[PDB]
Amino acid sequence: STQAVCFNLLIWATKLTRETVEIMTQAALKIVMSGVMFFENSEDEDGFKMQVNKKGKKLENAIKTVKKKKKQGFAEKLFKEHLKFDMEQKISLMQLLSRKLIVLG
Amino acid sequence: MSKITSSQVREHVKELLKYSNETKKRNFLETVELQVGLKNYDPQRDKRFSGSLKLPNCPRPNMSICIFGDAFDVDRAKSCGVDAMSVDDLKKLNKNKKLIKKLSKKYNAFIASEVLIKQVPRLLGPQLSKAGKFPTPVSHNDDLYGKVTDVRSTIKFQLKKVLCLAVAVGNVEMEEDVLVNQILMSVNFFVSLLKKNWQNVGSLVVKSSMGPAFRLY
RNA sequence: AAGCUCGUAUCAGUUUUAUGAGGUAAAGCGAAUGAUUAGAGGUUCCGGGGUCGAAAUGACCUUGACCUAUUCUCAAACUUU
RNA sequence: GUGAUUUCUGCCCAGUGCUCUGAAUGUCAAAGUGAAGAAAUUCAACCAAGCGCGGGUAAACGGCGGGAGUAACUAUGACU
RNA sequence: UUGACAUUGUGAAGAGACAUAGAGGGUGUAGAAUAAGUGGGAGCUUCGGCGCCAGUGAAAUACCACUACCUUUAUAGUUUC
RNA sequence: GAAGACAUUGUCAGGUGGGGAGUUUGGCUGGGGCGGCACAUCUGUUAAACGAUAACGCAGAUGUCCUAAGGGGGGCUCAUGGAGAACAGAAAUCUCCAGUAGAACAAAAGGGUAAAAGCCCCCUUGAUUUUGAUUUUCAGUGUGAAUACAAACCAUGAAAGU
């Protein structure tokens, strides 16, 4: 009906929708940003402040990617790490900072 | 000679410089027809969701010889019998597999794509594949084949900040070529995503094929 | 207060002749406003949410919008005419 | 500022100030320097200081049934 | 409180980035290759080289351009070190 | 015994500061008495979530509608209600009767008018230009709108006309 005729004809629509089925359907097939967010296909769209977005070993992947790449962001990361989950976040932040005033701070 | 009759640091209106006119009639000495290099500045991004996938009208032809590949099955081949350049059935898809390749832009549909996928490894060169870009996978072709014979502006997926396609030549008629360039901007400006940056106009650059270019704002 | 130009020369708190102009009376909500009222009985793979079968279109409820079957027909001061 | 002795903060530094040997090229006049120009006006970039960020400081002014973790990317703050 | 010139001389001054132009590398899978996001594919001296030469295949190799420049030199000189 | 071509004075964007001077107080809860100043365009967004909530800002349209719903000739004579029928129920298609307008007649609305001033089909470019005058407001104004002739250039119709 709604989603009926939806997939019928069948991306912001996709957005609301979720907001893999037809999902991963058109999937393989920055609003996109937010979406992939809430959402692996998300991983993909990702890899495609957007860093803040992406904020999974492949996450670590695109990570060291733009890492050596670029080689604000720092501040944001630190704030997020300061705001299981906790442990992971902390570790990641430390690794990034090591790869430093505010550091020891 | 040809440089002193052109401007590089001075902007002009469409009624001053070229922009599909005839100001390069005495400039271009060669009798061979040239192409319109209408360049445009439009800052975009690297997002696949941000792009124009339409088709410009362009009423007046560009005066050129071309040939398309008409091939349909089921019953659509009967409707496309009068307006066609070649038959090309289902069993005639193995003819171009040899050495003969006198087919430029072949047109098909979405129904006959199970066998068309075998022709893709040979016809992957020129940008004319069947996807979601250029309008092709569709059962309708009666009121579409009569349009492609009027020389349609084939829009492609460009990404560098330089934006230029193909208008015409500029040697047919004065006032006739004026109402042609009015669709090369109207369609482009129509498809404007909110995710884009700054403006979409920028600077307008128009040239020929040998002579210097200009600048329009 | 101080001047100029004229003469059968300016008319009317009372009586007869009804040609124009107007937006107070009437009406409507069936394309404009508002106090466009008040209920019951059904149908659930897949309109959107639970419990119970490792499962397969195996089965069974509740909580919001409709259809069928009724009632009123919308205050004179909202507007125009 | 407090105003004899005993008594004399339990915790917190996100906002309003001060200090700043922390952090300096996002923004930053004139002079000097750089195009066009027989001229005038306009004039892109560089730099100092201030502003932004952060920490300390509330016996100097507040807050004081407090401080966290929780399917929203920031917006409710139940339960524990 | 801060800065340039002048007041105020002299150039034996350690180490950088520029104001006009010509080479040097553009090396991720596969293709023996330098196919750098995008555009341009009938073309410039025409006797002659490449015009689309083979296998592979999302992009195929002269051609006036928005270009991120790893590392040097550069004529009369250079505001603050 | 300090030190140095150091430091201090004067005209040089702007920034720290009511020590001091000048200037600044219509009316607005029967005096006055918190802070802000988010009044009027369908929905989403604009807009920090069950209440409200503006903005000549952004993305179609939009300071309502029209690229024949204009003018003209011919033909036809509407809705609702009652009474019927092969597919077919109180609603759909066809036919008949009654019937002085609650209609139709460019925006929202209300009288008009019936061999229609309207609707449909067919036939179309006078909804465009030059030269005068008049009505309401006015100082026989600006702007805008309406009515009525002559002199060029068109369309419709059998004729008479607009």
Is-contact A28 A41, C-beta < 8 A?
A: yes
The token pair at A85 is 């989950």
What are phi and psi for residue B91, nearest 5 degrees? Answer: -85, -5
> How many angstroms separate the CA of residue A21 from the nearest CA in chain B?
21
Taking the CA of residue A50 and the C1' sugar atom of nucleotide D12, their distance in angstroms comes to 35
Scanning the structure block, which residue is given the tokens 């002009």? B12
Give CA–CA dist A18/A12, Å, rounded. 10
Edge-to-edge strand order for the sheet containing B37-41? B162-164, B37-41, B204-207
A-chain residues near B195 (CB < 8 A):
30-31
Scanning the structure block, which residue is given the tokens 């912001």? A12
DSSP 8-state class, residue B118: G
> How many angstroms separate the CA of residue A31 from the nearest CA in chain B?
8
Beta pairing partners, B41:
B162
Is-contact A38 A15, C-beta < 8 A?
A: no
DSSP collapsed to 3 states, A33-59: HHHHHHCCHHHHHHHCCHHHHHCCHHH
At CB < 8 Å, which residues of chain A contact B? 11, 30-32, 48
Contact partners, residue B31, CB within 8 Å, separation at least 6 = none
The token pair at A52 is 């803040």
**Nearest nucleic acid nucleotide to A2, CA to C1' distance:** C47
What are phi and psi for residue B30, nearest 5 degrees? Answer: -65, 140
Across the interface, do B47 and A32 touch by the CB < 8 Å criterion?
Answer: yes
Scanning the structure block, which residue is given the tokens 């599909």? B20
Pairing state of beta strands B68-70 and B204-207? unpaired
Which method, experimentally, gave rise to this model? cryo-EM
Angle subtended at Cα B133 by Cα A26 and Cα B68, rounded to the nearest 5 degrees? 135
Strand ranges inside B13-135, DSSP E: 37-41, 68-70, 105-107
Give CA–CA dist B165/B120, Å, rounded. 25
Give CA–CA dist B89/B72, Å, rounded. 7
Contact partners, residue B40, CB within 8 Å, separation at least 6 = B162, B163, B164, B188, B202, B203, B204, B205
Is-contact B217 B10, C-beta < 8 A?
A: no
Residue B101: C-alpha distances to residues B95, B97, B114 (Å): 9, 8, 21
Is-contact B60 B179, C-beta < 8 A?
A: yes
Q: How many CB atoms lie within 10 A of CB B195?
A: 14
Taking the CA of residue B79 and the C1' sugar atom of nucleotide D28, their distance in angstroms comes to 72
Buried b (16+ CB within 10 A) or exposed e, B144-167: ebeebeebbbebeeeeeeebbbbb
First and final C-alpha spacing in chain B: 26
Is-contact B163 B1, C-beta < 8 A?
A: no
The one-letter amino acid at B13: V
Listed as own residue / partner, the contacts of B211-214 with beta carbons closer than 8 Å and 24 or more positions apart are: B211/B2, B211/B6, B211/B24, B211/B27, B211/B28, B212/B2, B212/B3, B212/B6, B212/B8, B213/B6, B213/B8, B213/B37, B213/B39, B214/B6, B214/B7, B214/B8, B214/B12, B214/B17, B214/B18
Pairing state of beta strands B162-164 and B37-41? antiparallel
What does this entry list as its resolution, in Å? 9.5
Burial of A38 (0-12, 13-18, 19+ CB in 10 A): exposed
Is-contact B192 B46, C-beta < 8 A?
A: no
Burial of B107 (0-12, 13-18, 19+ CB in 10 A): buried
Of B187, B172, B164, whose CA–CA distance to B58 is shortest? B187
Give CA–CA dist A26/A8, Å, rounded. 13
